[PDB]
Amino acid sequence: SHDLDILPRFPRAEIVDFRQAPSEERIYPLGAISRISGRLRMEGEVRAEGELTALTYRLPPEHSSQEAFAAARTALLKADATPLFWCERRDCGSSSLLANAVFGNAKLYGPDEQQAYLLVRLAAPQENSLVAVYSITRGNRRAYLQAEELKADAPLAELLPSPATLLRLLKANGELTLSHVPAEPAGSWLELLVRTLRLDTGVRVELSGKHAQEWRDALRGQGVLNSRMELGQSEVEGLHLNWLR
């Protein structure tokens, strides 16, 4: 039928599967997916039930799955969605599990080394919406991209990415926004950013957003060197981070 209001246009891409459901359950992994003893295992997950819109695109032969995935990733982060998990190739675990057990679409099954997966939480006013993107290039040399929105029927918990996800995405995408942080820097989100900046001590960032000054100093007081953090100008409600190469 129609695209998700938040995604880009993949030039000449065709919708090959469209699904909607007013109350479907999704269990989106927050880490690699595998089977142990035949039972499904996720290294962290988010379960939510709500209105599901799932779009399956087949890309034109001229354009790679990885290109469309990067465009989708760039667009969701520029919409200031908080990233929750991002992974490429074998880091995602099994394509068969993602295709079948998570998205329930066997067309998405391909070589593990050709996949990519992203999960984000949309910014308020859509803060109980999750958007998931999955890309694959298959042996038939065709390229597909799955994009799904789950509007949860109940408010989502406090959902945070790992420090590894934050660092990796800051370098793969160059920037990202954390749009579900408290206005006063503290708690889980301050802890996450502190642990992210101790995992790579050389990386430098520019902070912007309505309370970016407050964040930088909370971080200085948790031990981050002030030389590592510059300040930008944005009115976005969240904390925006920009990789200073």
Numbering used by the authors: 24 to 268
Could you give the paper's own sentences about this structure?
The protein was found to be monomeric and the structure consists of two domains, domains 1 and 2, comprising residues 24–184 and 185–268, respectively. The fold of these domains could not be predicted even using state-of-the-art prediction methods, and similarity searches revealed only a very distant homology to known structures, namely to Mog1p/PsbP-like and OmpA-like proteins for the N- and C-terminal domains, respectively. Since PA1624 is only present in an important human pathogen, its unique structure and periplasmic location render it a potential drug target.
